[PDB]
């Protein structure tokens, strides 16, 4: 076996020119798609807040059109899913994880038009879901499409172009190139066996999509928090405690999203009509809240800059948290097209700020800024529910651009993951695959 | 299928013993890396102190610089040749094999040999980084705790070996993420599935970083400041720079390989001619660490000066050519010390040079050469040792100019692409292939 290694070591990092070039056209297409999707969602949110002007005088009629606009767009979203692509439900990260494990089909001819227009509706109604869901999955199918159209053969190409699509997808959903690659080589990849994924090819994909996103999203970051204060060595232990808190909460949030899937599955019983109607009901509630208390609704990217700056009161933060938990569970667990990834960053910001505030009053000699705790805790929920800390930590580091908080973020992130394990918690994306995959067996 | 459902529910379940033993490795790796970094600085300080006491008479101090660095080099080359020949050169290739179970981890030997040996070569002011020492010493420390606590398994043996070498690189650059990404891009068994627990690596990296920060906070290894931004219509320049790194990447691989061979003739395997030649190179480095300090040493001191564009065009060319020579000599000769760091300094110099050319050709892009310096800095690392992802994140963690990420990624990729298309090979894998193929022949 030594002699084979010597043969292999000399042939290391040699990806076929066909794969590299195809990963390029994957990234390009994922980027354009994720740009179109992002622009479409922003237009629908714009039309929706355009009607609340035509009906700004009649408050009951205002609250009516706030519900009825989000409802009709959610219904349309839930429908296109239920009728044309059941796989295009929820996030889609667990679906593309199954595709990389060769246990799920990548029916692109179905998901591409559904997840795109379906998500457009649910996100456009301002439901509490992210773009990751749509863009990562859509990304994976775009990679599959160009594998099929160009009829590319072999384990490397099918795994690589499927991974680079997912990577380009996340990278366009957060303008975070590194995060897309780190997401693949920690979370997306088959976790128990070797895989022929070319990391170099993943890169090219991620690059092109990042470039495509930067062509149409120049000079506006998704999250501008500005350079926060530093973190002194004697402060570190406080981030470990923050970790532990996220660590016990990570598995509990997973039980709620899994249970709520089951609890809402009774309300419709897997019926197309009761689902679409429950779907519009949840959606409408978001558009209502997307006026009366917008912190509780929407993706979650807007309150992040606010909460870090310490502009919310301890009263308001607690309210935001609870109401966002409820709205995150109602949207994701319901099976709407959209990721739980972005709302999980928003939740961690809130809870992190709340801890930070309590930390500031308790420790004046540390000279704390509740915002450093807000950032450390931002990707901490991703590190305790999703169980991808090295994805979360870098995802944050790319959006907030506060490298000087690298240790506190790691310490919190790792604290999240350790207690997430020690309290018997399961990787949310794997846990969803292992339930859908188990449901594929149990009915035989 | 049913196998996977069983696996998924058991994903990320590291045995607490591994996790706790990970924490103990990083701590030991960190503190040792701290002590190594203190010793080398200590010995460098002494050499400057001896130059002060014989400050008059030019040929007198040029001799005491040579002899100070020669004596210390000799001490290193000897400690390696006499007790642990495996601890020569980098050590990164040695540990990679150790992860493939194709090499032994003789910690009882390597630890003191690499520590005190590196102290010699580094402290004398040779063109070698701290990684070599710390990475190897790192793995060996991770082996020590395996043996001492009698931990059983493939996982425990691979994991504690990996975290050690990760924590090693971590405390060598104050770059936690780079260490972790190094393990999962280059260090890990590249062709089969391994039982390396990422969670355990992390914990180890944390500890060594905390240990490094407890001594070296408030002063960074490279301060560059916040550079300008890079507009989109500029990105193509970073592709070209990457292409230049793409062709030079393998040509530098050839030389380091070939100069390993040519320097093997001068001693023929003889412990005495080796030591005396290694002292001659070491002496040359201390002598040059006075008459043109940017050609000798680790090269960390010149990066800031290079990036600021303080050197002229000529001064850069010289510094490059001279540093091509001095890097080979010290690494190729099998002196204990990494090529990792000297390659950063090569990348900056070449980058700044390209940027200086760029600045005058295109006054409309409002360029700052220093941006190309930062994009080129880890481009050599992306084209020689062929770990672009580790390379990019390493630069990002030391320079802190995240707004230059696209330039950094495009250059780094444009290197690894043209390094693949011109025959080149991962330098740390090629050296492993040499050491393994020379073993079964």
């Amino acid at each position: 076996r030594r002699r084979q290694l010597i043969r292999q070591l000399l042939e290391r990092d040699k990806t076929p020119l066909a794969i590299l070039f195809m990963a390029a056209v994957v990234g390009t297409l994922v980027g354009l798609a994720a740009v179109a999707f992002d622009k479409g969602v922003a237009w629908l949110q714009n039309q929706r807040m355009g009607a609340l002007v035509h009906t700004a005088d009649n408050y009951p009629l205002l609250l009516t059109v706030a519900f009825l606009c989000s409802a009709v767009l959610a219904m349309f979203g839930y429908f296109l899913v239920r009728k044309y692509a059941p796989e295009a439900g929820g996030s889609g990260i667990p679906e593309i994880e199954g595709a990389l494990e060769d246990q799920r089909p990548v029916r692109w001819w179905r998901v591409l038009p559904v997840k795109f227009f379906g998500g457009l509706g649910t996100l456009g109604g301002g439901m509490v879901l992210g773009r990751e869901g749509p863009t990562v999955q859509i990304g994976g199918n775009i990679g599959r499409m160009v594998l099929d159209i160009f009829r590319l053969k072999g384990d490397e190409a099918r795994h690589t172009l499927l991974a680079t699509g997912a990577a380009a997808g996340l990278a366009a959903a957060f303008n975070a190139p590194l995060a897309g690659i780190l997401f693949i080589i920690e979370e997306m990849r088959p976790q128990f066996r070797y895989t022929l994924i070319s990391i170099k090819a993943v890169f090219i994909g991620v690059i092109m999509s990042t470039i495509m996103y930067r062509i149409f999203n120049h000079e506006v970051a998704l999250i501008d928090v500005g350079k926060l204060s530093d973190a002194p060595l004697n402060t570190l232990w406080l981030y470990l405690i923050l970790g532990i808190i996220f660590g016990i909460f990570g598995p509990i949030f997973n039980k709620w999203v899994l249970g709520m899937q089951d609890l809402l599955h009774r309300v419709h019983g897997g019926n197309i009509t009761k689902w679409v109607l429950m779907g519009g009901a949840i959606g409408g509630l978001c558009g209502l809240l997307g006026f009366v208390a917008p912190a509780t609704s929407g993706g979650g990217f807007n309150l992040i800059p606010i909460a870090t700056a310490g502009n919310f009161s301890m009263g308001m933060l607690v309210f935001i948290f609870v109401a966002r938990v409820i709205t995150t569970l109602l949207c994701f667990s319901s099976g709407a097209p959209g990721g739980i990834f972005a709302p999980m960053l928003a939740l961690g910001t809130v809870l992190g700020t709340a801890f930070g505030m309590v930390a500031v009053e308790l420790f004046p000699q540390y000279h704390l800024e509740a915002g450093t705790f807000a950032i450390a805790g931002m990707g901490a929920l991703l590190a305790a529910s999703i169980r991808a800390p090295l994805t979360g930590i870098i995802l944050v580091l790319e959006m907030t651009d506060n490298y000087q908080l690298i240790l506190p973020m790691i310490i919190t992130g790792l604290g999240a993951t350790l207690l997430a394990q020690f309290t018997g918690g399961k990787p949310l994306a794997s846990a969803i695959l292992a339930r859908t995959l188990a449901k594929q067996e149990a009915e035989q | 299928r049913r196998q996977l459902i069983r696996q998924l529910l058991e994903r990320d379940k590291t045995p607490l013993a591994i996790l706790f033993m990970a924490a103990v490795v990083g701590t030991l790796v960190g503190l040792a890396a701290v002590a190594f970094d203190k010793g080398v600085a200590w010995l460098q300080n002494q050499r400057m102190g001896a130059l002060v006491h014989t400050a008059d008479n030019y040929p007198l101090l040029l001799t005491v610089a040579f002899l100070c660095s020669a004596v210390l080099a000799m001490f290193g080359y000897f400690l390696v040749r006499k007790y642990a020949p495996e601890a020569g050169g980098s050590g990164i290739p040695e540990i990679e094999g150790a992860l493939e179970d194709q090499r032994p981890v003789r910690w009882w030997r390597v630890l003191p040999v690499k520590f005190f040996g590196g102290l010699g070569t580094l402290g004398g002011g040779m063109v070698l980084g701290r990684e070599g020492p710390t990475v190897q010493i790192g793995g060996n420390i991770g082996r020590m705790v395996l043996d001492i606590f009698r931990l059983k398994g493939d996982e425990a043996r691979h994991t504690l070996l990996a975290t050690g070498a990760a924590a090693g690189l971590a405390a060598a650059f104050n770059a936690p993420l780079a260490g972790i990404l190094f393990i999962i891009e280059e260090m890990r068994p590249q062709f089969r599935y391994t039982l390396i627990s990422i969670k355990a690596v992390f914990i180890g990296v944390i500890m060594s970083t905390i240990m490094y920060r407890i001594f070296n906070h408030e002063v960074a290894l490279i301060d560059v400041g916040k550079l300008s931004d890079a507009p989109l219509n500029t990105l193509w320049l970073y592709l070209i720079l990457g292409i230049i790194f793409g062709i030079f990447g393998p040509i530098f691989n050839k030389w380091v390989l070939g100069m390993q061979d040519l320097l093997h003739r001068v001693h023929g395997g003889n412990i005495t001619k080796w030591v005396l030649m290694g002292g001659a190179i070491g002496g040359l480095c201390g002598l040059l660490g006075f008459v043109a300090p940017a050609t000798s040493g680790g090269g960390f001191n010149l990066i800031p000066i290079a990036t600021a564009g303080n050197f002229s065009m000529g001064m850069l060319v010289f510094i490059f050519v001279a540093r091509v020579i001095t890097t080979l000599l010290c690494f190729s000769s099998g002196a204990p010390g990494g090529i990792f760091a000297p390659m950063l300094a090569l990348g900056t110099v070449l980058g700044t040079a390209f940027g200086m050319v760029a600045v005058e050709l295109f006054p409309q892009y409002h360029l700052e050469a220093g941006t190309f310096a930062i994009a080129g800095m880890g481009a050599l690392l992306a084209a020689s040792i062929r770990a672009p992802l580790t390379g990019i994140i390493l630069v990002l963690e030391m320079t802190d100019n995240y707004q230059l990420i696209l330039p950094m990624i495009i250059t780094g990729l444009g290197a690894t692409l043209l390094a693949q298309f011109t025959g080149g090979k991962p330098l740390a894998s090629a050296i492993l292939a040499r050491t393994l193929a020379k073993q079964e022949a």
Partner: antibody
Amino acid sequence: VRLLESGGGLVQPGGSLKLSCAASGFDYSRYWMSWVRQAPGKGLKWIGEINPVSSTINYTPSLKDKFIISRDNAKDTLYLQISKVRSEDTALYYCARLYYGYGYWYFDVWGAGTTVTVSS
Amino acid sequence: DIVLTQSPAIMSAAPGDKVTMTCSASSSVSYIHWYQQKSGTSPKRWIYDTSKLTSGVPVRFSGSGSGTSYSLTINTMEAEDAATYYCQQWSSHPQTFGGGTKLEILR
């Protein structure tokens, strides 16, 4: 954001005056600054630019020390020294903060202007 | 240095009219900018990169062109648009301005 250039007025032919533009409301570093002038009734002619670290200063096709563009990041101030002032230098002088979109630079925020009248 | 020439030097149209002015270049240019200078005020970055509108510029304004010909178009002009509109390129150093199109209003 506000640019308030001053120090102009009356100068004797062949003389020399120093214009100062005082900036506020934005980090004055990070930004390239520029000078643009407009002779009465006529259009815009670029004078010169300066980067934040003062390491690059480019001028329009002029002569010796005709224009000397400098800056003091400490005071948030841009300067323009005009030497051997002739009747063509009778104009309105704008300090303009420079920026770009896709990469081809524009004049982002313009100051009010100071008037220079060259006369005896 | 590229010589940009602005088509109408002075033009007059009544509100509601579609108005197109032109900035033509001696050599080839790309991503040219536009400036509005109303009487007695400093120029204001109006259109930039050929067709992007600065924040605050009403959507009645639009820009286009490529190579040598470029045009700023006001779709249904309004009386408050009475200004002088300078174009400017910086695709070739040094940057250079136009002569100006002085838009006048007919009421």
